[PDB]
């Protein structure tokens, strides 16, 4: 063994030994329980940075832990290679998208291999390859023919800077997820996935996810936004049928989410386009004035109609009103009004002097007609009043009673709605999966036959920056219709990158399977992802899509699971300084801190910052998430070349609990390296003074107290590291525990024959406990300590015999008559026995109150309080 810790020697040798052994290349092996641990794969949008090191070291710790415990561990890596992140990076570096993406992939792969992650590289997947994206084109055609995928014109989200439509989930704070530019509305046709068909299932299955952070589930519940409401029909009065447009002559249909207040409806409002407004204007020019004027912030306008509808629950005749807030296209284009318990209704009926009937009571609070209070709208603690046989019911009981009422009369029925909208996936972008549709002017939009898939995206295209490039390539889009054989045009829009991100975890199970998305036998074997690791930014963007896709694929018979990810760890962000300049196109040019010289004030505040290459200023933007797209990352390859990969991994797990934000610091890097030197030095000086021996094991009677205490600390540590990896998933406290063990070891004289045997046991355990975190140095130290393979020695076990404290039971006497019994320490002095003997209730009671006249102490045998 060399004295000095030289990572450039040992890290390549250790990786080659692991590679030759093929311990990460796994099969569908029924003789070992499976463990599928997966980190969210990266966009090829730049170089990986230390934030990725944190993300992928967490996965590697968990994978290597499970490997040492006998699991068949699959930890795959691949490349989220299609769509905006890779294509925008290509254009910003003046590179064609294909050539940029495959070169960036090769660099990212080198970075990850340098870090020694136990990755099955034979399952590597690149989503921009036809052997991958042909299968999402297949699913698309399958879903398109069932109507689960459809094309429709509509009002869509338009990004003027990325020059593409975007899905609702890609609109962040009204800005595009990659551009940060303000989104505009446009009428553009799009292909949609009918995710609202699965809205109930996506919502309710959240209850199954017991090992997901509650925050992710809360945000998906709010994004789905399920509303339980009631359709309610008010029959049109006999006096008000002038204009019989079918059922618009019989009744007026509304929707409401407060049917518990239906007894409180004092009028009804209707849209200017609704037939009620049409009939009540045939002889009303001041009605068509409102109709033309109208045809959440605008203050409400309204006009009475003179037509009347009937409350089905009590028979009250309510006047219909033309309203500015009712929009045809949202449901039946008509609403009811309960001014006493809805703020929007209270203000309208205050402006137009319309009655307000109190119908909900909330405990001690008194009602005030001309003065709204927030308790008027409590949907939790209220109780119904003035409501016939509904009196006394709370919201949830009254909801069901109203439904029973309305249904017996045929005048209503419950109806669910959701804020969730269907998923718009087509993009006016080149670098993405082609949409397998052909437009024939006779047959319509026809899917491409399965036998003709994939539609191969041409790869030698350089986007000019002016709209969809495929729209400009008739060598691509001119074709013949697959049903009639005549002239036709391919769809030139492509699929958003979140199509590929929505099923890659299944493709990893059989990445070379050429007859489907995923082979049946591997899908049955791997089941779901046991452990998933990625940032909280994916809570709605991707994690919702992935669950939807899983359910789509299950219903098509491709997989047999309801959810893709059983456990989810959302690691905290590595954050660091950020800088940029505004460019001529109004967009920021981000600049790496390594290229910035700063100027400070007397207190230490950075006041100025300049680019070192041109001496000209840059903007100090503040600490921020380490981001490829913000050019603020610290490249792991830089740390590896200076300090070793182990130092890089160790710093990221030690600096903070995994969910806590981690500020970058050079001091932390140095502290991690000194610990690795200490571990190297500790093993080196153990072996320099006698060489390895057989590790202590078995019964420890006859060991000195000092060596017993150390074995107690050793097996306590094993117990704690085990709990930290397997139950708590807290890696910093695992490292801290091992440091404490090494601290006690440094203070224990292990020079003796039994001493060296306990030293070997301590060091054999420590390097295994740390192997998931810093596997390179631990593989090298273990092979200097022990001739066997490390991954075959397995996870260290807890010797429970080493945990029993070393005690002793002394008998106490009074007058000589045995009067009690106490336990004390084995190393206890004569006085502590004397103090403990008097603390015995027995001796206290037998001695009465007399002071002791003497106390005879038999060494480790008896105490005689002569009272």
Ligand X SMILES: Nc1ncnc2c1ncn2[C@@H]1O[C@H](COP(=O)(O)OP(=O)(O)OP(=O)(O)O)[C@@H](O)[C@H]1O
440 binds, among Zn ion, ligand DCL, ligand X, none (CB under 5 to 8 A by kind): Zn ion
Q: Does 708 bind ligand DCL (CB under 6 A)?
A: no
Residue found under tokens 């029909």: 233
* Closest of 548, 503, 498 to residue 523, by C-alpha: 503
Binding part of the chain for ligand DCL, among 38-46, 339-347, 613-621, 738-746 by CB under 6 A, reads 38-46
Among 7, 35, 36, 42, binds ligand X (CB under 6 A): 42
128 CB-contact burial (10 Å; exposed 0-12 / middle 13-18 / buried 19+): buried
Binding part of the chain for ligand DCL, among 37-45, 484-492, 656-664, 738-746 by CB under 6 A, reads 37-45
Among 627, 647, 780, 786, binds ligand X (CB under 6 A): 627
Q: What is the DSSP string of 443-509?
A: TEEEEPPGGG---PPPS-----SSS-SGGG-HHHHEEE-TTT-SEEEE---EE-GGGGGGTHHHHTT
Of residues 497 through 516, those in contact with ligand DCL by CB under 6 A are 501
Q: Does 43 bind ligand DCL (CB under 6 A)?
A: yes
| Residue 66 annotated in ligand binding | no
Query: Within 10 A of 185 (CB to CB), how many other CB atoms are there?
Result: 9
* Backbone CA torsion sign across 495, 498, 502, 506: positive
Among 1, 21, 456, 484, binds Zn ion (CB under 5 A): 484
* Closest of 655, 639, 658, 656 to residue 647, by C-alpha: 639
Taking the complex as a whole, the smallest distance from the CB of residue 38 to ligand X amounts, in Å, to 10
Binding part of the chain for ligand DCL, among 35-43, 188-196, 459-467, 575-583 by CB under 6 A, reads 35-43
Q: Which is nearer to ligand DCL, 497 or 780 (CB)?
A: 497
Give the integer Cα–Cα distance in Å for 579 and 338: 54
Binding part of the chain for ligand X, among 13-21, 106-114, 263-271, 623-631 by CB under 6 A, reads 623-631
Q: Which is nearer to ligand X, 166 or 767 (CB)?
A: 166
Pairing state between β 807-814 and 606-611? unpaired
Give the integer Cα–Cα distance in Å for 315 and 235: 10
Q: Does 443 bind Zn ion (CB under 5 A)?
A: yes
Give the integer Cα–Cα distance in Å for 224 and 195: 10
54 binds, among ligand X, ligand DCL, Zn ion, none (CB under 5 to 8 A by kind): ligand X
Q: Six-digit token pair at 726?
A: 């397997």
Of residues 533 through 552, those in contact with ligand X by CB under 6 A are 534-535
Determine phi and psi for 549, rounding to 5 degrees: -60, -45
468 binds, among ligand DCL, Zn ion, ligand X, none (CB under 5 to 8 A by kind): none
Q: Could you tell me where the DSSP H helices lie in 30-162? A: 50-68, 84-92, 97-114, 130-146
Q: Which is nearer to ligand DCL, 540 or 687 (CB)?
A: 540
Give the integer Cα–Cα distance in Å for 50 and 576: 10
127 binds, among Zn ion, ligand X, ligand DCL, none (CB under 5 to 8 A by kind): none
Q: Does 336 bind Zn ion (CB under 5 A)?
A: no
Of residues 588 through 627, those in contact with ligand DCL by CB under 6 A are none
542 binds, among ligand DCL, ligand X, Zn ion, none (CB under 5 to 8 A by kind): ligand DCL
Strand order in the sheet with 807-814: 817-825, 807-814, 862-866, 854-858
Q: Does 629 bind ligand X (CB under 6 A)?
A: yes
Name the residue with the smallest CB distance to ligand X: 51
Taking the complex as a whole, the smallest distance from the CB of residue 450 to Zn ion amounts, in Å, to 17
* Closest of 552, 516, 547 to residue 529, by C-alpha: 547
Of residues 148 through 177, those in contact with ligand DCL by CB under 6 A are none
Q: Six-digit token pair at 295?
A: 């045809």
Q: Could you tell me where the DSSP H helices lie in 128-184? A: 130-146
481 binds, among Zn ion, ligand DCL, ligand X, none (CB under 5 to 8 A by kind): Zn ion
103 CB-contact burial (10 Å; exposed 0-12 / middle 13-18 / buried 19+): middle
Taking the complex as a whole, the smallest distance from the CB of residue 145 to ligand DCL amounts, in Å, to 27
Q: What is the DSSP string of 735-800?
A: HHHHHHHHHHHHTS---SHHHHHHHHHHHHHHHHHTTTTSHHHHHHHHHHH-SS-HHHH-SPPP-G
Q: How far is CA 638 from CA 435, 573, 633, 814, in A?
A: 41, 20, 11, 75
Query: Within 10 A of 696 (CB to CB), how many other CB atoms are there?
Result: 23
Taking the complex as a whole, the smallest distance from the CB of residue 481 to Zn ion amounts, in Å, to 3
Instruction: Specify which residues 236 forms β-bridges with.
Output: 309
Q: Does 542 bind ligand DCL (CB under 6 A)?
A: yes
* Closest of 40, 57, 22 to residue 535, by C-alpha: 40
501 binds, among ligand DCL, Zn ion, ligand X, none (CB under 5 to 8 A by kind): ligand DCL
Name residues whose C-beta falls within 8 Å of residue 602's C-beta, 6 or more positions apart in sequence.
none
Show the binding pattern over residues 60-89: x = contacts ligand DCL (CB under 6 A), - = does not: --------------------x---------
Binding part of the chain for Zn ion, among 475-483, 546-554, 789-797, 859-867 by CB under 5 A, reads 475-483
626 binds, among ligand DCL, ligand X, Zn ion, none (CB under 5 to 8 A by kind): ligand X
Q: Which is nearer to ligand DCL, 326 or 552 (CB)?
A: 552
Taking the complex as a whole, the smallest distance from the CB of residue 40 to ligand DCL amounts, in Å, to 4
52 binds, among ligand X, Zn ion, ligand DCL, none (CB under 5 to 8 A by kind): ligand X
Q: Does 45 bind ligand X (CB under 6 A)?
A: yes
Show the binding pattern over residues 568-587: x = contacts ligand X (CB under 6 A), - = does not: ---x-xx-------------
Taking the complex as a whole, the smallest distance from the CB of residue 53 to ligand X amounts, in Å, to 8
Query: Within 10 A of 164 (CB to CB), how many other CB atoms are there?
Result: 26
Q: Which is nearer to ligand X, 130 or 535 (CB)?
A: 535
Q: Which is nearer to ligand DCL, 43 or 731 (CB)?
A: 43
In 612-683, the DSSP E strands lie at 619-620, 624-625, 662-663
| Count of alpha carbons within 13 angstroms of residue 703, beta-carbon side | 26
Determine phi and psi for 313, rounding to 5 degrees: -90, -25
* Closest of 273, 251, 254 to residue 327, by C-alpha: 273
Q: How far is CA 526 from CA 351, 509, 512, 698, 703, in A?
A: 64, 7, 15, 39, 48
Among 295, 442, 612, 821, binds Zn ion (CB under 5 A): 442
Q: Six-digit token pair at 137?
A: 């084109």
Q: Does 41 bind ligand DCL (CB under 6 A)?
A: yes
Give the integer Cα–Cα distance in Å for 504 and 83: 15
Q: Does 768 bind ligand DCL (CB under 6 A)?
A: no
Among 66, 628, 715, 776, binds ligand X (CB under 6 A): 628
Q: Which is nearer to ligand DCL, 574 or 734 (CB)?
A: 574
Interface residues with ligand DCL (CB under 6 A)? Answer: 40-43, 80, 501, 542
Binding residues: 628
Interface residues with ligand X (CB under 6 A)? Answer: 40, 42-43, 45, 51-52, 54-55, 85, 534-535, 571, 573-574, 625-629
Binding residues for ATP: 628
Interface residues with Zn ion (CB under 5 A)? Answer: 440, 442-443, 481, 483-484
């Amino acid at each position: 063994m060399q004295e000095h810790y030289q990572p450039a020697a040992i890290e390549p040798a250790a990786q080659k030994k692991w590679d030759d052994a093929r311990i990460s290349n796994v099969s569908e092996d029924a003789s070992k329980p499976k463990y599928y641990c997966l980190s969210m794969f990266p966009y090829p949008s730049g170089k990986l940075h230390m934030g990725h090191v944190r993300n992928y070291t967490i996965g590697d710790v968990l994978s290597r832990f499970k490997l040492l415990n006998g699991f068949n561990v699959m930890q795959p890596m691949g490349w989220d290679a299609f769509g905006m992140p890779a294509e925008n990076a290509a254009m910003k570096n003046n590179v064609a998208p294909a050539a940029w993406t495959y070169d960036n992939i090769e660099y990212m792969k080198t970075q990850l291999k340098s870090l020694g992650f136990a990755v099955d590289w034979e399952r590597e997947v690149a989503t921009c390859k036809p052997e991958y994206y042909r299968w999402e084109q297949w699913l698309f055609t399958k879903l398109f023919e069932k109507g689960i995928v459809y094309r429709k014109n509509g009002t869509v989200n338009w990004d003027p800077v990325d020059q593409t439509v975007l899905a609702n989930e890609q609109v962040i704070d009204g800005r595009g997820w990659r551009s940060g530019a303000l989104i505009e509305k446009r009428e553009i046709p799009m292909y949609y996935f009918k995710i609202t068909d699965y809205a109930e299932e996506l919502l309710n299955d959240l209850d199954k996810l017991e090992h997901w952070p509650e925050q992710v589930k809360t945000m998906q519940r709010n994004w789905i936004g399920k509303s339980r409401g009631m359709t309610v029909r008010f029959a049109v009065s006999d006096d008000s049928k002038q204009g019989l447009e079918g059922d618009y002559a019989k009744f007026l249909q509304v929707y409401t989410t407060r049917p518990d207040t239906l007894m409180g409806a004092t009028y009804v409002a209707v849209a200017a386009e609704h037939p009620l407004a049409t009939a009540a204007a045939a002889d009303k020019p001041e009605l068509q004035a409102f109709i033309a004027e109208c045809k959440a912030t605008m203050e409400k306008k309204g006009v009475p109609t003179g037509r009347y509808v009937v409350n089905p629950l009590n028979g009250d005749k309510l006047e219909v009103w033309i309203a500015n807030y009712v929009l045809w296209g949202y449901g039946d284009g008509a609403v009811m009004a309960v001014p006493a318990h809805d703020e929007r209704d209270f203000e309208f009926a205050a402006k137009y002097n319309l009655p307000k009937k109190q119908v909900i009571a909330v405990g001690d609070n008194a009602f005030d007609a001309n003065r709204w209070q927030e308790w008027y709208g409590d949907k939790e603690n209220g109780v119904l009043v003035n409501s016939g046989d509904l009196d006394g019911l709370d919201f949830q009981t009254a909801f069901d009673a109203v439904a029973a009422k309305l249904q017996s009369q045929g005048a209503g029925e419950p109806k669910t709605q959701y804020r969730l909208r269907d998923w718009g996936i087509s993009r006016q972008r080149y670098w993405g999966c082609p949409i397998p549709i052909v437009h024939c002017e006779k047959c319509g939009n026809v899917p491409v036959p399965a036998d003709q898939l994939p539609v191969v995206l041409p790869e030698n295209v350089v986007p000019d920056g002016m709209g969809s490039p495929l729209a400009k390539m008739p060598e691509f889009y001119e074709t013949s219709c697959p049903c009639c054989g005549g002239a036709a045009k391919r769809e030139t829009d492509t699929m958003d990158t979140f199509i590929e991100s929505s099923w890659y975890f299944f493709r990893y199970m059989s990445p070379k399977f050429s007859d489907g998305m995923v082979s049946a036998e591997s899908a049955k074997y791997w089941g779901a992802v046991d452990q998933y690791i990625g940032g909280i930014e994916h809570a709605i963007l991707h994690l919702l899509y992935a669950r939807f896709f899983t359910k789509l694929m299950r219903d098509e018979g491709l997989v047999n699971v309801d959810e893709p990810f059983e456990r989810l760890l959302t690691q905290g962000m590595v954050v660091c300084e950020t800088y940029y300049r505004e460019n001529d196109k109004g967009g920021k040019d981000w600049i790496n801190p390594a290229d910035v010289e700063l100027t400070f004030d007397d207190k230490g505040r950075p006041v100025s910052a300049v680019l070192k290459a041109d001496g000209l200023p840059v903007v100090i933007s503040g600490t921020e998430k380490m981001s490829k797209s913000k050019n603020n990352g610290v490249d792991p390859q830089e740390l590896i070349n200076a300090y070793g990969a182990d130092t890089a991994r160790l710093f990221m797990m030690f600096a903070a609990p995994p969910e806590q934000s981690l500020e970058w610091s050079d001091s932390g890097v140095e502290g991690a390296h000194r610990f690795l030197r200490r571990l190297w030095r500790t093993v080196y000086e153990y072996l320099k003074q006698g060489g390895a021996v057989k590790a202590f094991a078995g019964n420890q009677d006859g060991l000195s107290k000092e060596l017993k205490d150390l074995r107690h600390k050793l097996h306590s540590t094993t117990a704690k590291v085990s709990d930290d990896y397997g139950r708590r998933q807290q890696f910093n406290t695992a490292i801290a525990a091992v440091m404490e063990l090494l601290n006690q070891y440094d203070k224990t004289d292990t020079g003796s024959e039994q001493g060296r045997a306990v030293a070997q046991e301590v060091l054999e355990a420590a390097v295994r406990l740390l192997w998931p975190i810093v596997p390179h140095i631990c593989e090298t130290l273990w092979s200097e300590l022990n001739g066997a393979k490390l991954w075959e020695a397995g996870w260290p076990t807890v010797d429970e015999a080493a945990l029993v404290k070393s005690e002793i039971e002394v008998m106490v006497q009074v007058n000589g008559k045995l009067r009690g019994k106490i336990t004390v320490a084995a190393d206890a002095s004569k006085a502590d026995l004397e103090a403990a003997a008097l603390a015995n209730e027995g001796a206290v009671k037998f001695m009465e109150g007399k002071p002791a006249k003497k106390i005879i102490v038999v060494p480790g045998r008896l105490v005689n309080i002569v009272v």
